[PDB]
């Protein structure tokens, strides 16, 4: 599978001068020399491998290396500007590195020549593929020095906080650093720098770490069974350092036994620490850390060692508090990326000069286009239209294109009646009923059922009862007291078990009702009941709507650091397109490919044919949640899976497939060159800003489209990569269409950051996790949706 080449440059849209956090990189037309490295012991951290290669290039210059400045990737790849005085045969080294001294055994063997002259030719002529070996060697060199001075996390670099302190609770703090990647861009290799931020464990005593994990201000008690387990799940695997002697250990368990009782070869840990170091423990009632050999360390002689990133999932408070500590307006990020570049001074890097690399000082300028927003057609008495302004519109004076007449509905309140008495319930429904009629969705009757409930165990008997008592019941409105295990059980019973539409509202939004909040509720409700909010004005769409076409969205969500991975593929069931049907699966954890894609597409194609009595001549497939590097393997499997579904439906059914990867997880940031064109308090680029030049691929079909308005922080322009196009789109035709699909998202009268198909697949995969809350065949059954609900947009 060869990716389609760029068919052309887009032409539609008002021009806008832009700055991008890409920096031009100039490399000489020279060969570089690539050697493979073997270090024994062979399973050491990359930070250790760099200390090994550093020692030997420091201590073996006369025999090999000499005045060369090699560059190293922390693993097995090492690159020099000129070839080492070695043949094809291996060269072994005995290295001893200073805590205490470790002896290492290192082997180097010649591998191959990497041509940067070849990388020049692909960027000018495109007659060969971009040589990844040339790009890899360039990235290793430009980041070798940072890898020796900072803490690498992925493609980022962090340093310990100096002066500042952004605690997250639970023993975790925030480290600020930067991202650095090297990609090719039409007119040169580009160095991509951005500000980055991730969580780390505080360098604090284990006692203090235990208190933050368990919430305690130190009133002596031992740890309960619940506390011992939760403390174990947080510190297991981490590393600690001792203070009584200065060694370092990896924690493998927490003893079920306190320090005064935990024994070993006979002798308790408390007496052993008295019988030596003359330490009388201040917390012998607390457990020890096990570091299976039987070595135990009490919590008070151990500190958490700094530099340990936190891969575990953060609480709702911890993500909210980190968002606030890291969000800066777009101009603020500009000057910060500029600060990092001045600090970097890449042209004065000795390793960058070794390979003759030259880095451009200022951010790349590029002229993008602000695409024109589509017009949304509403219905009702007025048949009004919506003209988006700054990627936003409202419902004022508009009714739904197809409004659902709500005749039978029930209310289930799960907050205590002390907090939500009858008087505030009546006011809520009255306000909602009025706004629902305004939007063309008449909530006509009073609730045929309205009771107070308590506990998640009451929803199924009550929902079973509602389905049996009230014929023609359309909606259940469930009022919840904040975060609760009732929401999952409401969705599990409603979506998977009984097939009943449900709209959950938080009790906080019932006591105080905003008309905007009520309007956003009806947007979901009308669609949960099979309605249509708006449609794209038809005659302003792409020509792919002249024949039957289906739009698919796809996403894969993985479990946090054995839960399964969840794949979701949604399919347009109409020609607007507005109504989407959903399919969902579970698969083994951390498999990026949608294994069941072939049959999931088959189900969507069959549902499309039942809803329209048409067979799609084209398939537009937006794929979300893709990591680069596995992209060829994902497309190969999934593009054949889509084709295989069509082969198994009819003997000679060959619709054209467009496969587009939607990437929001990247560090490409765009900025207004003119300050007068900054929009909002955040000062971001306008909604609809498109870029398909200067920073995109030399000869392949990709573009950036920031389809949304940036409320806070710096906007993330979505990158779109066309991997297959049987339908032979033009650049304008596909960029406008991607932008119009960003205006068909039902949960808000706004233009969102990714197309509605891809966003729905995300919602379906998240809803599947609430369905999996309390065997692969049993896991597969839990995400299956009731036959009444498959036919609707429950995930809204």
């Amino acid at each position: 599978f060869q990716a389609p080449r760029r068919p052309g440059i887009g032409t539609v849209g008002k021009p806008i001068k832009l700055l991008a956090n890409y920096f031009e990189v100039d490399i000489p037309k020279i060969d570089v020399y690539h050697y493979e490295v073997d270090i024994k012991p062979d399973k050491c951290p990359r930070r250790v491998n760099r200390e090994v290669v550093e020692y030997m290039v420091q201590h073996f210059k006369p025999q090999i290396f000499g005045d060369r400045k090699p560059v190293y990737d922390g693993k097995k790849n090492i690159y020099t500007v000129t070839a080492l005085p070695i043949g094809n045969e291996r060269v072994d080294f005995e290295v001893t590195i200073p805590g205490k001294d470790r002896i290492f055994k290192v082997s180097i063997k010649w591998l191959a020549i990497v041509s940067w002259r070849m990388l020049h030719e692909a960027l000018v002529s495109g007659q060969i593929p971009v040589p990844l070996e040339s790009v890899q060697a360039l990235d290793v060199a430009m980041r070798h020095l940072a890898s020796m001075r900072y803490t690498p996390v992925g493609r980022s670099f962090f340093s310990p906080p100096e002066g500042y302190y952004h605690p997250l609770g639970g023993g975790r703090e925030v480290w600020f650093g930067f991202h650095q990647s090297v990609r090719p861009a039409m007119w040169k290799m580009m160095l991509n720098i951005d500000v980055s931020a991730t969580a780390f464990y505080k360098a604090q005593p284990v006692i203090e770490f235990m208190c933050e994990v368990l919430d305690i201000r130190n009133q002596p008690k031992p740890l309960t069974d619940s506390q011992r387990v939760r403390f174990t799940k947080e510190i297991k695997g981490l590393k600690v350092e001792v203070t009584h002697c200065k060694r370092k250990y990896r924690v493998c368990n927490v003893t079920r036994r306190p320090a005064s009782h935990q024994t070993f070869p006979e002798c308790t840990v408390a007496q052993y620490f008295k019988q030596k170091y003359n330490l009388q423990l201040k917390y012998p009632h607390l457990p020890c850390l096990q570091v299976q050999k039987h070595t135990y360390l009490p919590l008070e002689v151990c500190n958490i060692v700094a530099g340990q990133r936190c891969i575990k999932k953060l609480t709702d408070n911890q993500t909210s508090t980190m968002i606030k500590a890291t969000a800066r307006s777009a101009p603020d990020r500009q000057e910060e990326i500029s600060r990092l570049m001045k600090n970097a001074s890449y042209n004065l890097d000795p390793y960058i000069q070794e390979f003759g690399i030259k880095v451009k000082d200022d951010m790349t300028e590029v002229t993008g286009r602000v695409l024109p927003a589509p017009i949304l057609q509403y219905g009702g008495r007025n048949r009004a239209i919506a003209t988006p302004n700054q990627g936003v519109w409202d419902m004022r004076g508009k009714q739904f294109y197809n409004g659902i007449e709500i005749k039978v509905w029930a209310i289930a309140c799960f907050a205590p009646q002390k907090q939500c008495r009858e008087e505030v319930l009546k006011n809520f429904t009255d306000q909602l009923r009025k706004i629902s009629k305004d939007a063309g969705m008449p909530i006509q009757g009073q609730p045929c059922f309205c009771k107070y409930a308590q506990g998640a165990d009451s929803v199924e008997p009550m929902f079973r009862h509602l389905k049996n008592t009230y014929s023609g019941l359309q909606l259940i409105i469930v009022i919840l007291p904040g975060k609760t295990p009732v929401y999952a059980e409401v969705k599990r019973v409603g979506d998977t078990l009984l097939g009943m539409a449900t709209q959950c509202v938080q009790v906080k939004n019932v006591v105080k009702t905003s008309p905007q909040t009520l309007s956003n509720l009806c947007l979901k409700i009308n669609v949960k009941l099979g309605g249509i909010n708006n449609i794209l004005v038809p005659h302003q769409r792409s020509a792919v709507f002249q024949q039957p076409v289906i739009f698919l969205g796809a996403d894969v969500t993985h479990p946090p650091a054995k839960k399964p991975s969840i794949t979701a593929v949604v399919g347009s069931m109409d020609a607007h397109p507005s109504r989407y049907c959903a399919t969902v699966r579970v698969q083994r954890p951390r498999q990026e490919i949608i294994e069941d894609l072939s049959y999931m597409v088959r189900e969507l194609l069959i549902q499309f044919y039942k809803s329209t009595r048409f067979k799609p001549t084209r398939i537009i497939f937006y794929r979300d949640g893709v990591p680069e590097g596995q992209l060829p393997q994902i497309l190969h499997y999934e593009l054949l899976a889509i084709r295989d579904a069509c082969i198994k439906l009819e003997k000679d059914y060959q619709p054209g497939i467009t496969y587009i990867v939607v990437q929001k997880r990247h560090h490409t940031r765009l900025f207004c060159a003119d300050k007068n064109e900054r929009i909002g308090k955040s000062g971001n680029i306008p909604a609809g800003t498109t870029v398909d030049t200067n920073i995109t691929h030399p000869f392949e079909f990709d573009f950036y489209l920031c389809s949304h308005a940036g409320i806070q922080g710096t906007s993330r322009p979505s990158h779109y990569y066309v991997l297959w196009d049987d339908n032979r789109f033009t650049a304008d035709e596909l960029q406008i269409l991607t932008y119009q699909l960003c205006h068909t998202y039902v949960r808000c009268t706004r233009s969102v950051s990714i197309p509605a198909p891809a966003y729905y697949a995300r919602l379906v995969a998240f809803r599947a996790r609430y369905h999996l809350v309390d065997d692969p065949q049993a896991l597969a059954k839990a995400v299956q949706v009731h036959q009444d609900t498959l036919r609707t947009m429950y995930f809204a």
């Binding site: 294109y401 197809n402 249509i532 038809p538 002249q546 024949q547 039957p548 069931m573 109409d574 020609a575 607007h576 109504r579 194609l605 069959i606 044919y609 039942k610 809803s611 329209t612 009595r613 048409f614 067979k615 439906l649 009819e650």
Partner: peptide, 17 residues
Amino acid sequence: NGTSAWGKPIDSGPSWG
């Protein structure tokens, strides 16, 4: 509502389903 107006609902193909 229609979801159609491609015209020509066709009774000339296997019924899938």
